[PDB]
Amino acid sequence: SNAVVLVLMKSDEIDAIIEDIVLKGGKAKNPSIVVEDKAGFWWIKADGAIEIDAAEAGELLGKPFSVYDLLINVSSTVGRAYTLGTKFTITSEL
């Protein structure tokens, strides 16, 4: 039902940034966003439109990382993920 989640493979640093970056950000237009962290798994869940990228994975291995990383981390693609050459995004309604 609309509900959509964003899932990454980071964690740790997120609960910190999700908090100072999303806690409030997901508190304005966002009704209430959850923040999951699994030692190398940044799983966040929102009820609108969440953003996500893969460039970082490139600075890490610097190869298909853009996607090989989005594919392994976007596993929670639920509402698919519109890509943007360098960054993609997962949402629900059009």
Curated annotation (Swiss-Prot):
Task: Say yes or no: keyword Oxidoreductase present.
Answer: yes
Which keywords fit this entry according to its UniProt record? Monooxygenase, Oxidoreductase
Q: Which domain of life is it from?
A: Bacteria
Q: From the Swiss-Prot or TrEMBL record, what is one GO molecular function term?
A: monooxygenase activity
Q: Which family does it belong to?
A: Belongs to the TmoD/XamoD family.
Subunit description = The soluble methane monooxygenase (sMMO) consists of four components A/MMOH (composed of alpha/MmoX, beta/MmoY and gamma/MmoZ), B/MMOB (MmoB), C/MMOR (MmoC) and D/MMOD (MmoD).
**Its biological function?**
The B protein acts as a regulator of electron flow through the soluble mmo complex, switching the enzyme from an oxidase to a hydroxylase in the presence of the substrate.
What is the protein's name according to its record?
Answer: Methane monooxygenase regulatory protein B
Q: Which organism is it from?
A: Methylosinus trichosporium
Designated gene of the protein: mmoB
Q: Report which part of the complete sequence is shown.
A: 35 to 128 of 138
